Design a protein around this ligand. Structure first.
Ligand code: CLA
Ligand code: CLA
Ligand code: CLA
Ligand code: CLA
Ligand code: CLA
Ligand SMILES: C=Cc1c(C)c2cc3nc(c4c5[nH]c(cc6nc(cc1[nH]2)C(C)=C6CC)c(C)c5C(=O)[C@@H]4C(=O)OC)[C@@H](CCC(=O)OC/C=C(\C)CCC[C@H](C)CCC[C@H](C)CCCC(C)C)[C@@H]3C
Ligand SMILES: CCCCCCCCCCCCCCCCCC(=O)OC[C@H](CO[C@@H]1O[C@H](CO)[C@H](O)[C@H](O)[C@H]1O)OC(=O)CCCCCCCCCCCCCCCCC
Ligand SMILES: CCCCCCCCCCCCCCCCCC(=O)OC[C@H](CO[C@@H]1O[C@H](CO)[C@H](O)[C@H](O)[C@H]1O)OC(=O)CCCCCCCCCCCCCCCCC
Ligand SMILES: CCCCCCCCCCCCCCCC(=O)OC[C@H](CO[C@@H]1O[C@H](CS(=O)(=O)O)[C@@H](O)[C@H](O)[C@H]1O)OC(=O)CCCCCCCCCCCCCCC
Ligand SMILES: CC1=C(/C=C/C(C)=C/C=C/C(C)=C/C=C/C=C(C)/C=C/C=C(C)/C=C/C2=C(C)CCCC2(C)C)C(C)(C)CCC1
Ligand SMILES: CC1=C(/C=C/C(C)=C/C=C/C(C)=C/C=C/C=C(C)/C=C/C=C(C)/C=C/C2=C(C)CCCC2(C)C)C(C)(C)CCC1
Ligand SMILES: [Cl-]
Ligand SMILES: [Cl-]
Ligand SMILES: [Fe+2]
Lengths: 167, 33, 65, 38, 505, 341, 34, 81, 37, 34, 30, 36
C-alpha cells in the first residue's frame, strides 16, 4: 500500500520534479553518507587498546572519561583526503552538522507532501522545448510524463466518471 | 492460497539453524565467567 | 616436531622462507610481461566487443559451420 | 589483413602510451628539481 | 575470547590444520558435486532431447559432465538420444561415484592432518618457528597447474587421449562430443571457435610451466617482498580472491553472451538470440528456399525440424524468468509435447499479417498485427467502444502450415485471438501442464541461474579482496592506531613528505 | 636514491591537495568524467540516440539536461573515439552517444583511483583503512547500475543517462518493468539508507544535547578543543536517557560508530545485488499464489494487484517514446485505461 | 616569499577557467530564439 | 599551513584583481562567442531550432546501425539540404 | 606430541545474541513471503 | 574556421595580460628552485 | 500455514523485545 | 597585498552570482525552453 501511494502521488503531483522532495533525497542520501563517513572516521582512528584476538570494542569501557579515538588523526586523514579546510576538527560542529543535514532535508520533504496536499505540484516542463516550426522536441521531462500518464489512467480504474481527476 | 509447500521448511530452517548457532555460542560464553 | 619420511623428502622445498633477491631484482622484466599481457587482454576484449574487427574472425555462432 | 579497426587500435595504443609517457616525463622532471631536503 | 567472525584465524600459523581445513572444504565440494549429480540423475527425463532437453528440466551439473564428454548412463541411454550405448565406467553414475569416494578419502586425510598438525616440514629449519615459503610454493603449484592445463588441452580436448568436448552447429541442432583440433591463427581468440579453447590450454599451459620454473628458481625482489608482505599468508588470500572474482566475471559474461564453452544444447538459448531473431531468420531462410525449390506452403514448413522451431520461442529465452519463480522451466509453461505448426494470419482482404513479438523486457504485451510494411492492420483492443482494428471488424483468420495443426484454418474470432496471444511468444507449442502441475509463468534457464549466481558471487568476492588486502597492508594497526601518534605527524606542513619523519624543516 | 623514490618523494609531499601515486589515476579520470558531463549537458544532443533534446544549448534546464546513453543499435560497444563507430570524428562521436561511455568508464577508473587515495593517505597517516572499506558501497552501486545492469540487457541504451530527470525516468522504468519496489534487496537498501539517515540525525542530536559544560558562553561550539583527552559529551547520561525513552541504548562508543559504518554500507551492498538480478530480468515481479487466486476469483483484490495495473499503464504509455528503436505503434484502442481517464 | 605557481594554482585554474567560459556560453544561450 | 599563499590574501590583493578583471571577462566573452558565432553547433553536431526535422518530416532520424551509424546521420543531415 | 597451542576460546555476549536473533527473525519475516510465493 | 580565432582571441589577450603583470614575480620563484 | 508462520515470527520478535529491554546486560560504569 | 577589504569582494561577487542566475531564470521564460 505504501508503494501504491507513492506511485499515485507521482502521477498526480510529479513529486520527483518537486524541489522539496529533491531536498529529501539529499537529506537522506547525505545522511546515509555522513553516517558512513563519521562511523568510518572514528572507527579508523580508534586507539590501540586490545589485541588481535579480541573485539576492539572492548577498548572502550562505558563511562570512561578519556575519548576512545584520536580526532586529530581523523582530521589529518580526512583533511588530506579532500583538503584541510573541508574537514572538521571541532567535534561539536561535526556532530551538529550530522544532526542538521538529515533533519532539515526531511523537514523539507515533509513540507513537500504537506504542500502538494494543496496541489502545488512539481515543475512541469511538458512540451517546453519546441523547434522553429513548433514541433514538440521531447526531453526527459516528456518521457517522465508518459510514465505519469500510464499511472494516471490506470489508478482506481473504476472510480472516475468524468475526464479530470481533480482530487 | 496455492503457496509453495517447501516455503514452510525453508522458513523454519532459515530461522532455526542460524538462531541455534547463536544460542550455542552464548550459553557456552556464560559458562566461562 | 614430528619427522616423517615424506617430510624429509619435501624438506628443501620449504627451507628458504624469507630469502629475497636484492633491490629491484627482476621487477623491470615483470613489468614488460605485465604490459604485454594488458595489450593482449585489450585485443581479446575488443574482439569480443567488436571494436576490433579482423579478417576471418567472425564473432558469431556461425563460426561453428 | 590490416583492417581499419586494427589501425584504429594502434592509433589508440600509441595515443595512450604518448599520454602516459608524457605524464611520467613531466613528473620525473619536477620531482628532480623540487626534492625534499633531509 | 575470539568473536564469532574470527574463529578461523586460529589456522593462520598452523599449516597442518590449515591443510586439514582445506582438505575438509575440498571433501565437501566434491561431495556436493556427487550428491547433485545423483539427484539430477534421479529426476532427469532422457526420453526427448528435442523438446524436453536437460536445460528445460533444471539440470545444472549434467551439462558440465556432458560438456567434457560424459554423455551416457549405465541405464543404456545417452543425452544425444541414442539408445543401447555402453559408456564404460565413466557414465554419469560413475562420475558421481568417483566424487563421492573422493569426498570420503579427502575426509580421512583431513582427520590425519588435523591430528598430526605438528610436522617438522612446516618449521623453518633456522628459527624453529612455523613458516611457509610462499614464493616457492607459488612456483611449484603454478608448475603443476601448467602441466595439467597443458595436458588437458593437448590430450583430453584433442582426443589424442580423451573424448574431446561438446561442439555443435550454429543453430544447436546436431551437437555431440568430438575431438577438436587447435586453432592457432587469430580466429582462435574468437569465443565462438572451439579450436581456440584447445590452443589456449596448450599455449597457456606451456607458459605456466615456464613461469612455474621461473618462480621455483628465482627469489622475489626485496622491494616486492616488502611491498606485498610476502611473508604474510593473507597477502595470498587477497590476490587469490581478486583472481577468483576476475574469473567469475568472465564466466558469468560468457554464459550470458554465449561462447564455444556454453553451447545452447546444454544450457539453452541466450536472450540475444531472441533479441536478434536469430533462429527466426534461419527458419525463414529454409522456408523461402523450400519454396524456391517449388514446395507447397505445407511442404516448406513441415520441413522445419521441431527442435529449431522450439528455439524460436520466448519461453526458452533466459531473460523471461523471476528470482523467486523456482524450479525447472517445465514447471512454468509445462513440458513441450509438439510443435503445433507455424501460424499465418490474414485479414478479410487476404493480406498476410504478422504478430508483433513480445520483447524480453515486458511481462505482458498487447496483441498487435502488422502487414509486411509495419502498418497496424489489426489488434486485440482494450477499450471496445472506439475500436477500429478488432479481429471481428478485420476478419482475421489463422492458418497453420507444418506441425500438428498443418493445413488447418480457423476463422471463429475467439479461437483466432487465442493463437494470436500465443504468437507473440514466437512459434506455438503444445504443452503438458498437468504432469508437473505447471502454473503458466515463465522461469529462467540454467544459463540464467548460473549467470546470476556467478555475477553475485563475483561482486561479493570483490569486497573480500578489499577487506583482506586492507588487512594485509594495515596489519600493524588492525587493533588500533598507535596510542602515541603525535599531532605533528598529522598536522599540516610539519613534514615535507607525509608520514616520513625524516623530512622536517 | 633512484628516480622511483625521487618521484614517490614528490607525489607524497604535504600540500594543499595531496597527490600520491593514486593521484595519477584519480585526477585525470575524475576531471574527465566531470568535464564530459558538463560538456554534454551544456552542448550535446540526444536527438540521434533518443529523439530527445538534452543540453542547455537546445533549451533544456538543469533538471532536464543529461548526457544520454548510446542508441540501442550500438549494443555494448565501448564506443571508443577511434573505434569503428565514430572513426575518429569527434562530432559524430558526440552524436552517437560516445560521451556516455567516456563518462561511465573514466568515472569507474576515478572511483578506483579515489578508493586507492583513501588507501594511500590512510597508510601515510597511520590510521586504519575503514573509510576506504566503507567506500566499497558506492562502488558496488555504481558498477552494478551503470555497468552490470545494461551489460545484462541488449545495450547501454537501457543504463541510466547522466541527468536529473533522466534518472527520474530510470526510477519509473524500474517500477513498471521490474517492479523493483517489491524486491527484498531494494527494501534492504531502503532500510540501510533510511536507517543511516536516522542514525546520523539521532547521533548528532544526542551528542549536542548531552554536552558537558566546558565554557561559559551560550555558543557551546567554543568549548571543544581538538586535542583535549576528555569526552565532550556524556555517554552515561546519553545512555540513561535512551534506555528510558526507547528501552535500549548504546553503551559502547566503539560499537556505535562501527554500527554507523555498517548500516548504510550493508544496505547499499544489498541493493547492488538486486540490480544484478535485474541485469538478467530476474525480478521479484509477482507472487504466484496471488495471481492464481486473482485469475480464478474476480472479487479478490489487494494492493499487490493494484500496483501491477499501474505498472501495466506505465509500460504501455511510456514504451514507444522511451524505446524509439522498437517502433512500437500502439493504436488508441489497445492502451490500458480505467474509466473516463 | 610565497610561490605563485603551485599544484594548487593548477587545480584551481583547471576548474575555474572553463567554468567562466561555460557561464559565458550559457549566458548567450538565454538569448537564442526559435 | 602547507606553505602556499592564503586564498584570503590573494583575492584581496590588488595585483590579483589587476589580472583577473581581464581574464574573467575575456573567458566569459570567449564562451559567449562560441555560442553567438554558431561554432558550438558545428563542433558538437547539435541541431539548430530549424534542423531537427525536415519541413514535412515527423520521423526521428534515429541511428539504427552500429557500423554504418556515422553514414546514417550524414544521410539524415543531407535530407535537410 | 604437544597439544595444539593455537586453540582459542570463542565469545558471544548477550547483546550480540539479541542483535543476531533480531537480524535472523527480521530476515525471516522479510523473505518468508517470497519463499511461499 | 574563422569563428575559432574569434573565440580564442579574448583568451590569448587574457593570457597575454597575465603574462606581463606576473612575469617579474614569477621569475623570482624559478631562480629559487635551486 | 503461511498465516501461522508469519504471526509466529512476529510473536518471536515481540518476545525478543521484552528480553532485550528487561533482561539486558546492565551497563556498568568504568 | 591585502588592500581590498574582503567584505567588498564578497558583496560584488555576491551580486555577480545573482545577476547570472537571474539571467538563467529570465531565460526559462524567453526563447528556447519557454514553451512558446
Ligand atoms: C532513489 C530514489 C528515492 C529516494 C532516495 C527517495 C527518498 C524519499 N522519498 Mg521519494 N519517491 C521515489 C524515489 C525516491 N525517494 C519515487 C520513485 C517516487 C514515486 C513513485 C517517490 C515518491 C515519494 C512519496 C510519495 C513520498 C516519498 C517520500 C520520501 C522520503 C521517504 C523517507 C521519509 O519520508 O522519512 C520520513 C520519516 C518517516 C516517515 C518516519 C516516521 C516514523 C514515525 C514518527 C514513528 C514510527 C514508529 C513505528 C511504527 C514503530 C517502531 C517501533 C518498533 C519497536 C517497531 C525520502 C526523502 C515520502 C516523504 O517525503 O514523506 C514526507 C513520501 O510521502 N517519496
Ligand atoms: C581427480 C580429478 C577430477 C576430475 C577428472 C574431475 C572431473 C569433473 N568434475 Mg570434479 N572435482 C574434483 C576433481 C576432479 N573432477 C575435486 C578435487 C573437486 C573438489 C574441489 C571437484 C569438484 C567438482 C564440482 C564442484 C563440480 C565438478 C564437476 C566435474 C565435471 C566437469 C569439470 C569441469 O568443468 O571443470 C571445470 C574446471 C575449470 C573451468 C577450472 C578452471 C581453472 C581456473 C581457470 C583456474 C586456473 C588458475 C591457474 C592457477 C592459473 C594457471 C596459469 C596458466 C598460465 C596455466 C568433470 C566430470 C562438475 C560436475 O559436473 O559435477 C558433477 C561440478 O559442478 N567437480
Ligand atoms: C551456483 C549455484 C547453483 C546454481 C546456479 C543452481 C541452479 C539450479 N538449481 Mg541447484 N543447488 C545448488 C546450487 C546451485 N543450483 C546447491 C548448492 C544446492 C544444494 C542446496 C542445490 C540444490 C538443488 C535442488 C534440490 C534443486 C536445484 C535446482 C536448480 C534449478 C532451479 C534453481 C532455483 O529455483 O533457484 C532458486 C533461487 C532462489 C530462490 C534465490 C535464493 C537466494 C536467496 C534469496 C539469498 C538469501 C539472501 C540472504 C538471506 C541475504 C542476507 C544478507 C545480509 C543479512 C548480510 C537451477 C538449474 C532445482 C531443479 O530444478 O533441479 C531439478 C532443484 O529442485 N538445485
Ligand atoms: C577463499 C575465500 C576466503 C577465505 C579463505 C577467507 C578467510 C577468512 N576471512 Mg574472509 N572474506 C571472503 C573470503 C574468504 N575469507 C569474502 C569473499 C568476503 C566478503 C564477504 C570476506 C569477508 C570477510 C570479513 C569481513 C572478515 C573475514 C574474515 C576472515 C577470517 C575469519 C573468518 C571466520 O572465522 O569466519 C567465521 C564465520 C562464521 C562463523 C559463519 C559465517 C556464516 C556465513 C555468513 C554464512 C554461511 C554461508 C554458507 C556456509 C555457504 C558458503 C558460501 C559459498 C560461497 C560457498 C579468515 C582468515 C574476518 C577477519 O578478517 O578476521 C580477522 C573478517 O572480519 N572475511
Ligand atoms: C523510500 C524511498 C527510497 C529510498 C530510501 C531508496 C534508496 C535507494 N534506492 Mg530506491 N527507489 C525508490 C525509493 C527509494 N529508494 C522507488 C519508489 C523506486 C521506483 C522503483 C526506486 C528505484 C530505484 C532504482 C531504479 C535504483 C534505486 C537505488 C537505490 C539506492 C541508491 C544508492 C545510492 O546511494 O546511489 C547513489 C549512487 C552511487 C553511490 C553511485 C556512485 C556515487 C559516486 C561516488 C558519485 C560521485 C559524485 C562526484 C564526486 C561529483 C558529482 C558532482 C556533480 C553533480 C556536479 C538506495 C538503496 C539504486 C540501487 O539499488 O542501486 C544498487 C537504483 O539503481 N532505487
Ligand atoms: C547520489 C548520492 C551520492 C553522491 C552524489 C555521493 C557522492 C560522494 N560520496 C563520496 C564519498 C563517500 N560516499 C560514502 C558513502 C555513501 N555515499 C552515498 C551516496 C552518494 N555519494 C551513500 C548513500 C553512502 C552511504 C554508504 C562514503 C563512505 C564516502 C567517502 O569516503 C567519500 C567522501 O569523501 O565523502 C565526503 C565522494 C566521492 C568523491 C569522489 O569520488 O571524487 C572523485 C570523483 C570522481 C572519481 C568522479 C566520479 C564520476 C561519476 C562516478 C560518474 C559521472 C557523474 C557526473 C559528473 C554527474 C552526473 C549527475 C547526474 C547523474 C545528475 C562524493 C562527494
Ligand atoms: C544448512 C541448512 C539450512 C539452509 C537452508 C535454510 C533455508 C534457506 C532456504 C533458502 C532457499 C529458499 C528456497 C525457496 C524455494 C523452495 O522452497 O523451492 C525449492 C527449489 C527447487 O524448486 C522446486 O523444484 C521442484 C522440481 O525440481 C518443483 O519445480 C517445485 O515446484 C519447486 O519448488 O529449491 C532450489 O531451487 C534449490 C537450489 C537453489 C540454489 C540456487 C541459488 C543460486 C542463487 C545464488 C545467489 C546467492 C545469493 C546470495 C546473496 C547473499
Ligand atoms: C575553485 C574554483 C571553482 C570551481 C568551479 C567548478 C563548478 C562546477 C560545478 C558544476 C555545477 C552544475 C550546475 C550547472 C547549472 C546551470 O548551468 O544551469 C544552466 C541553466 C541555464 O538555463 C536554461 O538555459 C537555456 C538556454 O537555452 C534555456 O533558456 C532554459 O530555459 C533555461 O532553463 O540554468 C538553470 O537551469 C536554472 C538555474 C538553476 C541552476 C541549477 C541549480 C544548482 C544545482 C546544484 C548544482 C549541482 C550540485 C548538486 C550537489 C548535490
Ligand atoms: C594530452 C596530454 C596531457 C597529459 C599531460 C599532462 C601532464 C600533467 C602535469 C602534472 C604536473 C603539474 C603540477 C606541477 C606544476 C608546478 O607549478 O609545480 C612545480 C613548480 C611549482 O613551484 C613550486 O611549488 C612547490 C609547491 S607544489 O609542489 O606545487 O605543491 C614549491 O615546493 C616550490 O618552492 C615552488 O617553486
Ligand atoms: C567417509 C568415507 C566414504 C564416504 C563418503 C561420503 C558418504 C561422503 C558424502 C559427502 C556428501 C554427500 C557431501 C555433501 C555435501 C553438501 C554440501 C557441502 C552442500 C552445501 C550446500 C550449501 C553450501 C548451500 C548453500 C545455499 C543454500 C543452502 C541456499 C541457497 C543459497 C546457497 C547456495 C548459498 C567412502 C565410502 C568413500 C570411503 C571411506 C570414508
Ligand atoms: C569532454 C572531453 C574532453 C574534456 C573536456 C573537459 C575537461 C571539460 C571541462 C569542462 C568544465 C570544467 C566545465 C565547467 C563548467 C561549469 C559550469 C557551467 C558551472 C555552473 C555553475 C553554476 C551555474 C553555479 C551557480 C550556483 C547555483 C546554481 C546555486 C548555488 C550557487 C552557485 C553560484 C554555485 C576532452 C578535451 C579530453 C576531449 C574529449 C571530450
Ligand atoms: Cl490504484
Ligand atoms: Cl469522477
Ligand atoms: Fe560521534
Amino acid at each position: 500500500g505504501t508503494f501504491n501511494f507513492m506511485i499515485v502521488f507521482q502521477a498526480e503531483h510529479n513529486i520527483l520534479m518537486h524541489p522539496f522532495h529533491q531536498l529529501g533525497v539529499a537529506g537522506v542520501f547525505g545522511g546515509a553518507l555522513f553516517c558512513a563517513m563519521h562511523g568510518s572516521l572514528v572507527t579508523s582512528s580508534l586507539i590501540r587498546e586490545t589485541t588481535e584476538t579480541e573485539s576492539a570494542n572492548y577498548g572502550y569501557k562505558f563511562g570512561q572519561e578519556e575519548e576512545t579515538y584520536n580526532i586529530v588523526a581523523a582530521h589529518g586523514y580526512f583533511g588530506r583526503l579532500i583538503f584541510q579546510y573541508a574537514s572538521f576538527n571541532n567535534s561539536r560542529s561535526l556532530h551538529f552538522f550530522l544532526a542538521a543535514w538529515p533533519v532539515v532535508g526531511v523537514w523539507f520533504t515533509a513540507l513537500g507532501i504537506s504542500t502538494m496536499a494543496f496541489n502545488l505540484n512539481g515543475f512541469n516542463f511538458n512540451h517546453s522545448v519546441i523547434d522553429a516550426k513548433g514541433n514538440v522536441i521531447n526531453t526527459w521531462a516528456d518521457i517522465i510524463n508518459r510514465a505519469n500518464l500510464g499511472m494516471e489512467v490506470m489508478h482506481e480504474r473504476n472510480a472516475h466518471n468524468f475526464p479530470l481527476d481533480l482530487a | 492460497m496455492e503457496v509453495n509447500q517447501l516455503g514452510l521448511i525453508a522458513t523454519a530452517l532459515f530461522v532455526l539453524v542460524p538462531s541455534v548457532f547463536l544460542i550455542i555460542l552464548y550459553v557456552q560464553t556464560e559458562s566461562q565467567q | 616436531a614430528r619427522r616423517t619420511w615424506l617430510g624429509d623428502i619435501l624438506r628443501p622445498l620449504n627451507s628458504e622462507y624469507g630469502k629475497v633477491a636484492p633491490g629491484w631484482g627482476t621487477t623491470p622484466l615483470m613489468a614488460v610481461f605485465m604490459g604485454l599481457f594488458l595489450v593482449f587482454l585489450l585485443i581479446i576484449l575488443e574482439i569480443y566487443n567488436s571494436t576490433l574487427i579482423l579478417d576471418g574472425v567472425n564473432v558469431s555462432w556461425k563460426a561453428l559451420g | 589483413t590490416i583492417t581499419p579497426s586494427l589501425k584504429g587500435f594502434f592509433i589508440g595504443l600509441l595515443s595512450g602510451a604518448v599520454v602516459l609517457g608524457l605524464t611520467f616525463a613531466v613528473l620525473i622532471a619536477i620531482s628532480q628539481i623540487d626534492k625534499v631536503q633531509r | 575470547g575470539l568473536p564469532w567472525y574470527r574463529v578461523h584465524t586460529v589456522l593462520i600459523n598452523d599449516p597442518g590444520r590449515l591443510i586439514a581445513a582445506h582438505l575438509m572444504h575440498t571433501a565437501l565440494v566434491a561431495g556436493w558435486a556427487g550428491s547433485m549429480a545423483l539427484y539430477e540423475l534421479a529426476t532427469f527425463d532422457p526420453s526427448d532431447p528435442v523438446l524436453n532437453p536437460m536445460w528445460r528440466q533444471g539440470m545444472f551439473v549434467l551439462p558440465f559432465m556432458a560438456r567434457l564428454g560424459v554423455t551416457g548412463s549405465w541405464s543404456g541411454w545417452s543425452i544425444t538420444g541414442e539408445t543401447g550405448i555402453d559408456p564404460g565406467f565413466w557414465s554419469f553414475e560413475g562420475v558421481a561415484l568417483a566424487h563421492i569416494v573422493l569426498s570420503g578419502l579427502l575426509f580421512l586425510a583431513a582427520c590425519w592432518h588435523w591430528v598430526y598438525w605438528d610436522l617438522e616440514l612446516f618449521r623453518d629449519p633456522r628459527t624453529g618457528e612455523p613458516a611457509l615459503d610462499l614464493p616457492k610454493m607459488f612456483g611449484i603449484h603454478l608448475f603443476l597447474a601448467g602441466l595439467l592445463c597443458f595436458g588437458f588441452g593437448a590430450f583430453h580436448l584433442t582426443g589424442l587421449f580423451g573424448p574431446g568436448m561438446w561442439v555443435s552447429d550454429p543453430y544447436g541442432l546436431t551437437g555431440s562430443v568430438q575431438p577438436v583440433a587447435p586453432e592457432w591463427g587469430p580466429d582462435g581468440f574468437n569465443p565462438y571457435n572451439p579450436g581456440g579453447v584447445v590452443a589456449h590450454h596448450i599455449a597457456a599451459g606451456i607458459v605456466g610451466i615456464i613461469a612455474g620454473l621461473f618462480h621455483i628458481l628465482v627469489r622475489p625482489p626485496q622491494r616486492l617482498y616488502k611491498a606485498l608482505r610476502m611473508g604474510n599468508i593473507e597477502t595470498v588470500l587477497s590476490s587469490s580472491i581478486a583472481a577468483v572474482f576476475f574469473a567469475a566475471f568472465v564466466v558469468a559474461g560468457t554464459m550470458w553472451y554465449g561462447s564455444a564453452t556454453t553451447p545452447i544444447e546444454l544450457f539453452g538459448p541466450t536472450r540475444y538470440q531472441w533479441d536478434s531473431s536469430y533462429f527466426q531468420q534461419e527458419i525463414n531462410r529454409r522456408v523461402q528456399a523450400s519454396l524456391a525449390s517449388g514446395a507447397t506452403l505445407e511442404e516448406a514448413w513441415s520441413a522445419i525440424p521441431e527442435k529449431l522451431a522450439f528455439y524460436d520461442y520466448i519461453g526458452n529465452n533466459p531473460a523471461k524468468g523471476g528470482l523467486f519463480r523456482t524450479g525447472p522451466m517445465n514447471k512454468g509453461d509445462g513440458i513441450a509435447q509438439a510443435w503445433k505448426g507455424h501460424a499465418v494470419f490474414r485479414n478479410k482482404e487476404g493480406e498476410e499479417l504478422f504478430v508483433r513479438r513480445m520483447p524480453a523486457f515486458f511481462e505482458s504485451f498487447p496483441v498487435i498485427l502488422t502487414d509486411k510494411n509495419g502498418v497496424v492492420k489489426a489488434d486485440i483492443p482494450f477499450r471496445r467502444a472506439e475500436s477500429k482494428y478488432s479481429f471481428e471488424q478485420q476478419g482475421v483468420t489463422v492458418s497453420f502450415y507444418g506441425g500438428e495443426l498443418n493445413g488447418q484454418t480457423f476463422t471463429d474470432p475467439p479461437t483466432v485471438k487465442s493463437y494470436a496471444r500465443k504468437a507473440i511468444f514466437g512459434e506455438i507449442f503444445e504443452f503438458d501442464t498437468e504432469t508437473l502441475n505447471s502454473d503458466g509463468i515463465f522461469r529462467t534457464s540454467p544459463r540464467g541461474w548460473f549467470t546470476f549466481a556467478h555475477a553475485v558471487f563475483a561482486l561479493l568476492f570483490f569486497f573480500g579482496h578489499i577487506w583482506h588486502g586492507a588487512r594485509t597492508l594495515f596489519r600493524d594497526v588492525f587493533s588500533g592506531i598507535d596510542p602515541e601518534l603525535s599531532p605533528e605527524q598529522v598536522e599540516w606542513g610539519f613534514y615535507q613528505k607525509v608520514g616520513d619523519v625524516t623530512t622536517r624543516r | 636514491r633512484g628516480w622511483f623514490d625521487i618521484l614517490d618523494d614528490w607525489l607524497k609531499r604535504d600540500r594543499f591537495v595531496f597527490v600520491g601515486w593514486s593521484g595519477i589515476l584519480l585526477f585525470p579520470c575524475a576531471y574527465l568524467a566531470l568535464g564530459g558531463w558538463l560538456t554534454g549537458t551544456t552542448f550535446v544532443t540526444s536527438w540521434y540516440t533518443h529523439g530527445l533534446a538534452s543540453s542547455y544549448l537546445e533549451g533544456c534546464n538543469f533538471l532536464t539536461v543529461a548526457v544520454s546513453t548510446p542508441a540501442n543499435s550500438m549494443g555494448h560497444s565501448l564506443l571508443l573515439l577511434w573505434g569503428p563507430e565514430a572513426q575518429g570524428d569527434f562530432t559524430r562521436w558526440c552524436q552517437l552517444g560516445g560521451l556516455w561511455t567516456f563518462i561511465a568508464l573514466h568515472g569507474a577508473f576515478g572511483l578506483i583511483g579515489f578508493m586507492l587515495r583513501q588507501f594511500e593517505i590512510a597508510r601515510l597517516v597511520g590510521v586504519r583503512p575503514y573509510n576506504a572499506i566503507a567506500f566499497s558501497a558506492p562502488i558496488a552501486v555504481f558498477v552494478s547500475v551503470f555497468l552490470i545492469y545494461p551489460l545484462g540487457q541488449s545495450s547501454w541504451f537501457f543504463a541510466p543517462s547522466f541527468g536529473v530527470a533522466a534518472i527520474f525516468r530510470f526510477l519509473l522504468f524500474f517500477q513498471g518493468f521490474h517492479n523493483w519496489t517489491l524486491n527484498p534487496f531494494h527494501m534492504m537498501g531502503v532500510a540501510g539508507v533510511l536507517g543511516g539517515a536516522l542514525l546520523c540525525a539521532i547521533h548528532g542530536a544526542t551528542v549536542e544535547n548531552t554536552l558537558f559544560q566546558d565554557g561559559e558562553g551560550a555558543s557551546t561550539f567554543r568549548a571543544f578543543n581538538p586535542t583535549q583527552a576528555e569526552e565532550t559529551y556524556s555517554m552515561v547520561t546519553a545512555n540513561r536517557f535512551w534506555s528510558q525513552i526507547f528501552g535500549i541504548a548504546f553503551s559502547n562508543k566503539r560499537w556505535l560508530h562501527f554500527f554507523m559504518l555498517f548500516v548504510p554500507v550493508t544496505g547499499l551492498w544489498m541493493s547492488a545485488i538486486g540490480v544484478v538480478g535485474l541485469a538478467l530480468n530476474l525480478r521479484s515481479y509477482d507472487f504466484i499464489s496471488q495471481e492464481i487466486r486473482a485469475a480464478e476469483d474476480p472479487e479478490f483484490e489487494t494492493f499487490y494487484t493494484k500496483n501491477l495495473l499501474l505498472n501495466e499503464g506505465i509500460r504501455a504509455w511510456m514504451a514507444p517514446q522511451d524505446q524509439p528503436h522498437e517502433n512500437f505503434v500502439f493504436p488508441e484502442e489497445v492502451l490500458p485505461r480505467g474509466n473516463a481517464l | 616569499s610565497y610561490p605563485i605557481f603551485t599544484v594548487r594554482w593548477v587545480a584551481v585554474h583547471t576548474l575555474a577557467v572553463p567554468t567562466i567560459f561555460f557561464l559565458g556560453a550559457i549566458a548567450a544561450m538565454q538569448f537564442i530564439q526559435r | 599551513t602547507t606553505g602556499e599563499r592564503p586564498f584570503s590574501d590573494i583575492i584581496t590583493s590588488v595585483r590579483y584583481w589587476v589580472i583577473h578583471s581581464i581574464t574573467i571577462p575575456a573567458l566569459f566573452i570567449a564562451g559567449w562567442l562560441f555560442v553567438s558565432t554558431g561554432l558550438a553547433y558545428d563542433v558538437f553536431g547539435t541541431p539548430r531550432p530549424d534542423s531537427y526535422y525536415a519541413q514535412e518530416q515527423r520521423s526521428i532520424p534515429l541511428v539504427t546501425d552500429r557500423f554504418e551509424a556515422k553514414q546514417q546521420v550524414e544521410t539524415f543531415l543531407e535530407q535537410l539540404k | 606430541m604437544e597439544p595444539n597451542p593455537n586453540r582459542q576460546p570463542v565469545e558471544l555476549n548477550r547483546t550480540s545474541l539479541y542483535l543476531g536473533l533480531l537480524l535472523i527473525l527480521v530476515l525471516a519475516l522479510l523473505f518468508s513471503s517470497y519463499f511461499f510465493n | 574556421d574563422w569563428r575559432v580565432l574569434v573565440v580564442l582571441l579574448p583568451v590569448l589577450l587574457a593570457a597575454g595580460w597575465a603574462v606581463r603583470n606576473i612575469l617579474p614575480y614569477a621569475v623570482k620563484q624559478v631562480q629559487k628552485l635551486l | 500455514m503461511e498465516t501461522i508462520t508469519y504471526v509466529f515470527i512476529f510473536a518471536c520478535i515481540i518476545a525478543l523485545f521484552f528480553f532485550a529491554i528487561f533482561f539486558r546486560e546492565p551497563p556498568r560504569i568504568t | 597585498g591585502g588592500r581590498i577589504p574582503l567584505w567588498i569582494v564578497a558583496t560584488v561577487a555576491g551580486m555577480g552570482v545573482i545577476v547570472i542566475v537571474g539571467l538563467f531564470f529570465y531565460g526559462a521564460y524567453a526563447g528556447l525552453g519557454s514553451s512558446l
